[PDB]
Amino acid sequence: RRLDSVITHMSDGIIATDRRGRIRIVNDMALKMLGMAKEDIIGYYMLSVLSLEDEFKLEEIQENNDSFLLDLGLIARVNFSTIVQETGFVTGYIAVLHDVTEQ
Ligand SMILES: [Zn+2]
C-alpha cells in the first residue's frame, strides 16, 4: 500500500505526478539530468518529459516491474512505480532516475 519498497538513492532524480501523470514534484537532481528548467517540467506529462509517449503508457506502470535505460549526455536507468493510498487506490506515479555510473 502506502509503503513503496522501490529502491532510491540520495543522488537519484525523482519525479512524482498526479493521477493524470502530470508532474507535481521534481527534485534538483532530476532537473539537472534532464537539462530542463522546473517551469518547463511542473505540470507537464511525465511520459512526455521523459520522451516516452511513443513507447509507454501510464496504464502499464502498475503491472510493470521492468526498469529501462533512457538517454536524458546522461544514461539513466528509470524505474516507475505507483503511489497508492490506504485503500489501494492509485493517486499518482513516481519515476526514479538512477545515473548508470552510480556507485
Ligand atoms: Zn539510484
Side-chain angles (χ1 to χ4, degrees), residues 28-80:
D28 272 6
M29 184 57 48
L31 294 176
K32 234 134 278 186
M33 299 178 171
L34 292 161
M36 293 288 292
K38 183 179 193 165
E39 299 75 29
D40 295 340
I41 298 301
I42 292 291
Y44 290 83
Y45 285 134
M46 170 181 68
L47 292 184
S48 296
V49 168
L50 299 173
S51 305
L52 289 181
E53 53 187 74
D54 228 336
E55 316 275 327
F56 200 70
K57 322 179 175 186
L58 285 173
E59 298 94 293
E60 311 180 56
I61 289 175
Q62 198 179 58
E63 289 192 302
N64 170 78
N65 314 111
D66 292 332
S67 292
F68 309 98
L69 282 193
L70 286 189
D71 186 45
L72 298 179
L74 189 144
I75 296 295
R77 184 177 79 260
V78 189
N79 181 235
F80 295 102

Side-chain angles (χ1 to χ4, degrees), residues 1-10 12-16 61 64-67 77-84 92-98:
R1 289 290 155 91
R2 307 188 53 220
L3 286 178
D4 198 346
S5 66
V6 59
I7 318 90
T8 291
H9 306 129
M10 165 83 154
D12 290 351
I14 300 280
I15 294 166
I61 289 175
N64 170 78
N65 314 111
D66 292 332
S67 292
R77 184 177 79 260
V78 189
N79 181 235
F80 295 102
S81 194
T82 62
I83 308 170
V84 180
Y93 302 99
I94 293 276
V96 182
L97 313 181
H98 308 267

